[PDB]
Amino acid sequence: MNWSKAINFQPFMLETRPPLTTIPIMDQLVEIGERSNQKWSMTDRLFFAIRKINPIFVTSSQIPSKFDYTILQMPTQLIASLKETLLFLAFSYYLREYQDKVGQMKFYPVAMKNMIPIVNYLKDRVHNNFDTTLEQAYRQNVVHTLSASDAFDLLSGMIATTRLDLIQRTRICPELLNVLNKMSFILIYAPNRPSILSWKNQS
Amino acid sequence: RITEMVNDRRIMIQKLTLAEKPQVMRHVTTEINNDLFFKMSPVAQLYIYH
Amino acid sequence: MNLEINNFAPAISSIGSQLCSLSAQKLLTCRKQYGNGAKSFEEFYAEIGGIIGMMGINSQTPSGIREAIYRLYQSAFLFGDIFPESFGIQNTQNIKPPPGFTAPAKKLEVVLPQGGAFDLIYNNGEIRVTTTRNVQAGDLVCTVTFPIQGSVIATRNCHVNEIGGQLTTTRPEIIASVPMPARTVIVASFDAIEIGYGEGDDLFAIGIAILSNRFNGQITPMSRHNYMTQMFANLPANMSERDSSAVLHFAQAAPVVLGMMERLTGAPKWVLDY
Amino acid sequence: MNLEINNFAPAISSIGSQLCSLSAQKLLTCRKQYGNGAKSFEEFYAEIGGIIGMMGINSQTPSGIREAIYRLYQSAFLFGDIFPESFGIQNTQNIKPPPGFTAPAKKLEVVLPQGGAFDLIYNNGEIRVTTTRNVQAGDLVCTVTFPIQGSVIATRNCHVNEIGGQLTTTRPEIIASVPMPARTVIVASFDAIEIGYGEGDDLFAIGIAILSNRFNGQITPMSRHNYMTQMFANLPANMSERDSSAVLHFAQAAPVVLGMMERLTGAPKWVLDY
Amino acid sequence: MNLEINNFAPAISSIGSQLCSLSAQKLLTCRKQYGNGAKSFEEFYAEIGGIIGMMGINSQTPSGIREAIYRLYQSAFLFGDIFPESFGIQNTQNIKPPPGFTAPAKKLEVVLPQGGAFDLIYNNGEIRVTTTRNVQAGDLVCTVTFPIQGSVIATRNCHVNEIGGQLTTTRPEIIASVPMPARTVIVASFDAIEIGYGEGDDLFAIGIAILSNRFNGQITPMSRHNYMTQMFANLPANMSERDSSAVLHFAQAAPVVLGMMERLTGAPKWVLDY
Amino acid sequence: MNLEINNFAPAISSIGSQLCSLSAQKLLTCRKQYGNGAKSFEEFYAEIGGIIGMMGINSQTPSGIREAIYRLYQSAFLFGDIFPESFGIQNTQNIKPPPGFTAPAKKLEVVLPQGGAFDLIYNNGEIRVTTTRNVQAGDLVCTVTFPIQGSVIATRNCHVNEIGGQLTTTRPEIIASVPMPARTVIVASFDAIEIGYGEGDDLFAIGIAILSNRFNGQITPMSRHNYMTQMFANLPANMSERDSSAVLHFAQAAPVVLGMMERLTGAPKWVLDY
Amino acid sequence: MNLEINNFAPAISSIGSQLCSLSAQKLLTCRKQYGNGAKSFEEFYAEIGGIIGMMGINSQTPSGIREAIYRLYQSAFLFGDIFPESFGIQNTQNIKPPPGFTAPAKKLEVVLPQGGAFDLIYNNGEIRVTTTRNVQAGDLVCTVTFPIQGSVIATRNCHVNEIGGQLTTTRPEIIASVPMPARTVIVASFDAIEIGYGEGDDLFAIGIAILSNRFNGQITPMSRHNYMTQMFANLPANMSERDSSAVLHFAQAAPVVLGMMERLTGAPKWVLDY
Amino acid sequence: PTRYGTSESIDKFKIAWENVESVLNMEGNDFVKTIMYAYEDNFPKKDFYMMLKQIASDGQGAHPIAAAIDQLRTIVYREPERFGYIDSVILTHNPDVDTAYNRFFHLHPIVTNQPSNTIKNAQLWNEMRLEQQVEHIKAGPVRIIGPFHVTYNYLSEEEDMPATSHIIMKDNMILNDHLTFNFVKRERRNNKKRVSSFRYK
Incomplete structure (x- = not known):
């Protein structure tokens, strides 16, 4: 019976909130970070954007967090790859339009694999070009070198839920369907068949 | 400051536009003790009567 | 006394020290214009001695500034890790040197x-x-x-x-x-x-008990010398000598202000002239 | 008999039972208005046996209800990948208790x-x-x-x-x-x-053969007792006892209705009074 | 299980059975009209359902029918001799035969x-x-x-x-x-x-406990067979076979209806068709 | 008795305790003005006693409050990691101290x-x-x-x-x-x-069974002393004494209010005067 | 003690308890607004402590409540099984539950x-x-x-x-x-x-003497525990727990209120919140 | 008897006395009214009121309508739409129709979404600004609790649907105070056809 048509309350997203007495203080620090440029996007220059992607291992949900800068990981020993990291970054960027600004609690997807080595590797060897973006890197690396099914399997393995679980949860909340459409995914449903996956370009 | 006072009334103020938040204004509040008028005086009966 | 200090401590400490200085100035100003009368000095201070306004804090009672001190102290010296380290390093806002x-x-x-x-x-x-x-x-x-x-x-x-x-x-x-x-x-x-x-030092002795009654598991009453030595030894390894000074100034100014709000005597120069 | 019950089985069963109840109530209305005319009862029912106002049944003929029942049963008890897309299995937050x-x-x-x-x-x-x-x-x-x-x-x-x-x-x-x-x-x-x-029990005997001819590799004809024993043994352990009742109700309602649509007799009370 | 049945029991039972049948019919009618959604079936029953047009019972809540049953049962089988008109029940010789x-x-x-x-x-x-x-x-x-x-x-x-x-x-x-x-x-x-x-029988098991938690000094939980035997052995000697059936129908229907009101499943035919 | 206290328990417990307190106040307010008349006290209560203005309740009957209590208790204490998305738990900024x-x-x-x-x-x-x-x-x-x-x-x-x-x-x-x-x-x-x-304590005894009939695998009926000892032993070590009291107040008040809704007697002071 | 309890004791008790609660609430209402002047509290209570709208009571002074309590106690618990027509009893079945x-x-x-x-x-x-x-x-x-x-x-x-x-x-x-x-x-x-x-318990000792000075042939001063043991022993066998609770509540409330009307202290919770 | 008896302040006597002096001013009560007003100094209004109160408490029966209203108010609770009122309304951007009523109506305003962030009364929503209003709608369905005065229109499939201005977006999303709803009935004439939600949306 555990299921909800709300994107923020899906099994793969974690709710976080500072201690209930330190909430006013953490608001001032978020404004301090807004004064500096402390926000990563998929449209700004990758040279600038990769300087502000610092995933942190989570041990408790009582942690301060900012909507446009925080990405979370759980303590593990597995190592992610470039494609998994790009898929997770795109997922977390397109999943933040539905973030709840009015409330004191924030929801964030967790990364099953360690992305720190890949982020450091990428940061060591990126030049200051005027046109390269994170979305461009995603399109060149994931869309043009993988099938939709393989990329969906990678994304499912990068969050706790299995492939069948994503396909099932996509039918209940339309927000997840929109999020996956933004990542250039297409789902086709036919009777008596399992779902097939395709990129938006080839459909 | 206005929305945080606690009294018998619920004060509601529409949220300020992001641009109109720095706008400056003057609000003078007096800082003086009023407890020195309420002493015992040889003309207190006059105060009561009037 | 077990406690952990994060890397945002200087930023929290600047606000805390400014609040302490404002409260001390408010107390002295209300003290110099107190006319002896029916209303006691404690009542006189509670009415128009806690109303201090600045960025963030918006309370008009001594309990309000007491709770502000509690919040700042917990966020600076007892909360484990506020943010990833790079967020703090890239802060541009600057602070003011504390007294020697x-x-x-x-x-x-x-x-x-x-x-x-x-x-x-x-x-x-x-x-x-x-x-x-x-x-x-x-x-x-x-x-x-x-x-x-x-x-x-x-x-x-x-x-x-x-x-x-x-x-x-x-x-x-x-x-x-x-x-x-x-x-x-x-x-x-x-x-x-x-x-x-x-x-x-008299105010520190009675303020350390006040802030130890709240954080009983982390803070215990002790001497000022031992308190300062432990706070210095618990500082993070990588910090400039400018930031540690602000952190220690706030760490010592919080108990003295807590004790000064209780005993309505004057404030020390190092708290007042921040 | 090998079968794999998915995690959404109560939601599928709550739709299947309602569909079966609606189909049974249509047959009783048809029986009362037959009129003993030139058309046979089987011909009379084929023209007017379709449920109205039910989403996911494309045809207006008992064939549409048969196809819907086949799809729901296959999704619920046979393959976890398939999940029907035309029925209101989105607003399945709560389920109605089945008859005892x-x-x-x-x-x-x-x-x-x-x-x-x-x-x-x-x-x-x-x-x-x-x-x-x-x-x-x-x-x-x-x-x-x-x-x-x-x-x-x-x-x-x-x-x-x-x-x-x-x-x-x-x-x-x-x-x-x-x-x-x-x-x-x-x-x-x-x-x-x-x-x-x-x-x-008779209607189950007719319907189990129909249901097994399609799924010859998963379902074989047997008595109702063996069917229930195996179905109950194949339920997940960590399931509320209220959902198990719905699953076990649909697991019998489907063959009974399938056998009812062929032999145009009455319906059991536990099927119609859902 | 000690109890004293009055000779005016058929008059009380003819009303109690009618109340029970009306409640069961309302439950069925509002049960066929439920769409799966935010509200559970208990809330739906407690709100739109439970509305019966019956004289002498001025309650349209499930609790109201529950205590009407309590009062009627207590008057009919436990207090002793008592005139029906005392509780507003009209005492009339002309009554309906109960089901066999x-x-x-x-x-x-x-x-x-x-x-x-x-x-x-x-x-x-x-x-x-x-x-x-x-x-x-x-x-x-x-x-x-x-x-x-x-x-x-x-x-x-x-x-x-x-x-x-x-x-x-x-x-x-x-x-x-x-x-x-x-x-x-x-x-x-x-x-x-x-x-x-x-x-x-499933409803009786919980209804007997429901009405034993109230009349604990008179009634204890037991099987339906033992309850029927004890009820039958306590009827007055000088009464016709027509009144005995009317008394026993209510004697068995009160527990099953009390249980049906808890677990909102269907109702037996001998309760509905009275 | 197995249970995992989640890490947002005080926020859930504040809402739960406020809901229980409002229910108790409504019960006593309706109880004081019940003039003996045609309707009994329970029909009187079950008609106006559930109209409470609070976020999360999707009914105006005691069944709605009962289901809200069930959901809050399951989210706060049981193994289920379901966050109640329709209450105001997400917007909570501060809590009220519970009675001693x-x-x-x-x-x-x-x-x-x-x-x-x-x-x-x-x-x-x-x-x-x-x-x-x-x-x-x-x-x-x-x-x-x-x-x-x-x-x-x-x-x-x-x-x-x-x-x-x-x-x-x-x-x-x-x-x-x-x-x-x-x-x-x-x-x-x-x-x-x-x-x-x-x-x-009688209310606790009759409510622990009510909430154990639903969560049969996680909660078993027992005395209040054992229940409280197990709840305290299952509390995490990283908890302030002010939050633990807020958790325990709701942990004990949920069964008491559940049993209060059954037997419409008074309510204890520690529940109503929250 | 010698005393006979009739079959209509719950009806009398449901009126006596309501009268006791009304008197206690009026006592606290008058106790809240006492002027603290030249008049004592006894004169203040004797002047404005009466109930004016209850059928059955014939004076607006406290003596009226005392005399009504005497009549109700004598009718309910003493040898004379006299039914008080003066108080209005409409349904002998409706009984508000008493506190636990x-x-x-x-x-x-x-x-x-x-x-x-x-x-x-x-x-x-x-x-x-x-x-x-x-x-x-x-x-x-x-x-x-x-x-x-x-x-x-x-x-x-x-x-x-x-x-x-x-x-x-x-x-x-x-x-x-x-x-x-x-x-x-x-x-x-x-x-x-x-x-x-x-x-x-202090009010019971002073009120039992007050009501034993009147019914000296039937009631003697004693402790509360022995009084309640004998009162429970004298209850009829054909009595449910819902009714005996009301009988015992009135049996204890009458001496407590009688002694409270002499020593004008507060009233217990179980008397106020009936 | 529960409140405002002997302890009531003298300021409350104006309200209590108004009904008595209204009753005394009707036809057929002029003798008692004249005697009462002529000798107010010797027999004041308060003692007269207390005497009448004691007379009424001692078994004087109430007018039957008291019980009639008490019995009718229960009927009012159970069937709201017979008296033209609805307990609450849900404002939402993605409605989910209740399939059970599809059997009887081609299209209906009945949904089954689980509300989030209930709002006490319509006035609070109306006084809000649009930016905060749209944030509420995005997070999910929103519920307005206060009672309303609704009317229902039951229409045939052929008839065109009268327009209802539920929300007027003139400067802010303000709810109307009437909230007329439209049902279109399913008949044996048009039961196998499927009607688009075109005109409704």
Whole structure:
């Protein structure tokens, strides 16, 4: 019976909130970070954007967090790859339009694999070009070198839920369907068949 | 400051536009003790009567 | 006293010190215009002595500024890790230097070598050790762990690095100068200043209990010297000497302001003139 | 019979049961208005047997209801990948309780202990065991695996946990009460109800063959008792007992309605009164 | 289970049964109209359902019908003699006949004659006694104290009064047909209907507890068979067979309706069709 | 009894306690103005008693409040990691302190040292142990694992840390004060209060069964003392005493309010005056 | 005491309790606004403490409430089974539930088996018996005649039915569990609640004298516990727990209110919140 | 008897006396009214009121309408739409139709979404600004609790649907105070056809 048509309350997203007495203080620090440029996007220059992607291992949900800068990981020993990291970054960027600004609690997807080595590797060897973006890197690396099914399997393995679980949860909340459409995914449903996956370009 | 006072009334103020938040204004509040008028005086009966 | 200090401590401490200074100024101003009357001074302060406004805090009661102090103290000295480190390093907003330390160094903290050749007894601003065996001249006998700055006086059978009577290094090391037999004595007196502020120690004693009653598992009543030594030893390894000064100023100013709100006496200069 | 129940089985069952109830109510209305005319009853029902206002049934003929039932059953009990897309399985937050079970427990399933000290034979409503070796009083001799509930008719040389003639737990355990050597016999009878629904046994017999012809690799014809035993054994352990009732209700309603649509007789109360 | 039934019980029972049937009909009508969604079925029943147009009961809440049943049951079977008009119940000779009994006879009750000539054991629908001594044909062995009606099957070594397979009397007595030596056994089986109703045993189990938590000094939880036997053994001697059925129908319907109001499943036919 | 307290328990418990308090206030307000008339008290209550203005309730009947209590309890204490998305838990910025505990400490919980030197028994308000071998004065013989606070009366052959008759620490340890031979007896009585609430125990008894019928696999009926001890033992160590009280208040108030909704008697002060 | 309780005691009690609660609420209402002037509180209460709108009461002074209480008590509990037509009784079935009992069970009432086998001595909350002769395990030792509900603590050398430390039945029986020779002693302590309301014991003592000075032939001054034991012993057998609760509530409230109208202190919660 | 009896302040006597002096001013009560007003000094209004109160308490029966209203108010609770009022309304951007009523209506305003962030009364929503209003809608369905005065229109499939201005977006999303709803009935004439939600949306 555990299921909800709300994107923020899906099994793969974690709710976080500072201690209930330190909430006013953490608001001032978020404004301090807004004064500096402390926000990563998929449209700004990758040279600038990769300087502000610092995933942190989570041990408790009582942690301060900012909507446009925080990405979370759980303590593990597995190592992610470039494609998994790009898929997770795109997922977390397109999943933040539905973030709840009015409330004191924030929801964030967790990364099953360690992305720190890949982020450091990428940061060591990126030049200051005027046109390269994170979305461009995603399109060149994931869309043009993988099938939709393989990329969906990678994304499912990068969050706790299995492939069948994503396909099932996509039918209940339309927000997840929109999020996956933004990542250039297409789902086709036919009777008596399992779902097939395709990129938006080839459909 | 206005929305945080606690009294018998619920004060509601529409949220300020992001641009109109720095706008400056003057609000003078007096800082003086009023407890020195309420002493015992040889003309207190006059105060009561009037 | 167990506690962890994050890397956002200077930013929290600047706001805390500004709040403490504003409250002290408010108290002094309300104190100089108190006319003796039916209303007591405690009632007089509660009515128009807690109403202080600035960025963030918006309370008009002494309980409000007390809770603001509680929030800042918990966020700075007891909360585990506020944010990823790079978020703090890239802060551009700047802070104001705190006043210089004025606490006299009486019980200076030193550690003996692993050998156990010497025995350490303390006095007022003076460390004297005796030799259980014979030891060669020119080796370390004592080193100072608590930072100290000032002049050096009355050194016997030992040598310290000083020019013109003033110490050169913040952590002086005492070395033997002449060969000596067993059961001798070497002394080293100091006219110096340690970390902390000497004034307002009465308020600290009653404010540390107030903020220990709330954080009972983390903070316990103790002396000012021990409190400051533990706070300095619990600072993060990578921090500039400018930020640690602000952190320590707030760490000592919170208890004195808490105790000053209780006993309605004057505030020390290092809190008032921030 | 191999079958894989998914995690959304209660939601599929809540739609299947409603569809079956609506189909049964349409047949009774058709029976009352037949009029004994030139068209046969089978021809009359084919033209007017379609449910109205039901989403996900594309055709207006009983063929559409048959296809919907096939799809729902296949999704619920056979393959976890398929999930029907035209029915309102989105607003399935809460489910309606199904009618209570009414199947008499004639052949009740028990499992002997590993000792091999007893001999199991069956009767109409009672079980009895003969003792191969001398058995000490106060030990388990039998325990049921198919839940039952109801009174106890006659227990000799054995004791069960009952008060006022009513069984306490749904899995009673038979424990010897008196020392009993030399190949004795102990008998226990029950007036109880097993999981299932008694009426519609013929309709189940016709419908199970229809349901098994399509799924020849997963479902084979068998009695209702074996069907229920296997279906209950294949349920997940960590499931609320209210959802299990819905799943087990649909698992029988589907074959019964499939057999009802071929032999145009009445419908059981437990199907129509859902 | 001690209780004193008044002679005005049929008048109270004719109202109680009508209230129960109306509640069951309302439950069915509002149960067929439920769409799965945010509200659970309990909230839906408590809000839109439970509205019956019945005189003398001015409550449209489930709790109101619940305590109407409580009051009617307490008046009819526990207080003692009491006039129906006292509680606003009009007492009228003209009433409706209740539905016929449908309870299957499994543990039929018999009483051995004095002298210890025989020993009795029970089976699913049969009684078997063994002769401890020699007995000549033409004497009683057993007699049913609980009225029974139905056909007789498999009568061995004994004779009963029957024509065409149907028992002539409601209380048959078994008489040995041929003398038997050497501790043989005589068996009498029946296909008969006892006093009570068969459908709805699950609801009775919780309804009896519901009304035993209130009248704990009068009623205790037990099986339906024991409850029916105790109720029947306490009826007044001078009353017709028409009033006895009316009393017993309410006596059994009150627990099952109280249980049905808890678990919002269906209702038995003998409750709805009154 | 297994359960995992989630890390946002105080926020859930604040909403739950406010809901329970509002229900109690509505019950007493309706109870004061019930003028004896045509309708009984329960129809009167079940019609206006559920109209409470609060986020998360999707009904105006007591069934809605019951289901809200079920959801909040499941989210806060049970293994289910379901976050109630329709209440105001996400927008909570501050909590209100709960009323102080008033449960008498009659069966105080103590854990003996591993030596086996002593045997422990219980009395109305004290414990006593008998030495098995010679024990020298100055070592532990007992210590309390369950938090307690209050005064000490009638201590013999043992010393407890206290000033003026008032216990110093919340978990006092009992140590011998006189060297004693084996078989000597020592006692310690306490006039103290344990964690919990003493009033509304019948309501707790009739509500624990109500909430155990639903969560059968996680919660079993028991006494209030055992329930509170298990809840306290399952609390995480990283919890302030102000949050733990807020969790425990709701943990005990949920069964009390659930049983209150059944028997429409009064409510305890610690529930209504939240 | 000698006293006869008629079958309509609940109807009288439901009016007496309402009158007592009204008088207590009026007392607190007048106590809140006492001017504290030259007039004493007794004159203030005598001037404005009356009820003006209740049918049955013929004066607007407190004496009217006193006289009504006298009439109701005499009608409900004394020899004269007089039905008071002056107060308006419309339904003898409708009875608002009274608050649950709060009286701690210190002196529990138990009776010996009549074999002259055990010695009985009492304590604060426990009974303990010594075996005069040899006793085998599994036989009755004691049984309680005053119903009791609560928990069980410190059960040694005996057995009681319990689930999770909570008593199962309201009249527990103590049976030995081990063969115990040579004049051993067994104990049984209960942390339970007897019948009645512990609060307001001072007012009961002064009110029982007030109502015994009038009904001196039937009522004598005594303690609350003995009064309630005899009152419960005089209850009719044909009485449910819902009605006996109201009877006992009025039986205790009448002396408490009579003594409260003399000593104008506060009123207990169980009287105010009826 | 529960409140405002002997302890009531003299300021409350104006309200209580108004009904009595209104009753005394009707036809057929002029003798008692004249005697009462002529000798107010000797027999004041308060003692007269207390005497009448004692007279009424001693078994004087109330007018039957009291019980009639008490019995009718229960009927009012159980069937709201018979008296033209609805307990609450749900404002949402993605509605989910209740399938059970599809059997009877071609299209209906009945949904089954689980609300989030209930709002006490319509006025609070109306006084809000648009930016905060759209944030509420995005997070999910929003519920307005206060009672409303609704009317239902039951229409045939052929008839065109009268327009209802539920929300007027003139400067802020303000709810109307009437909230007329439209049902279109399913008949045996048009039961097998499927009607688009075109005109409705």
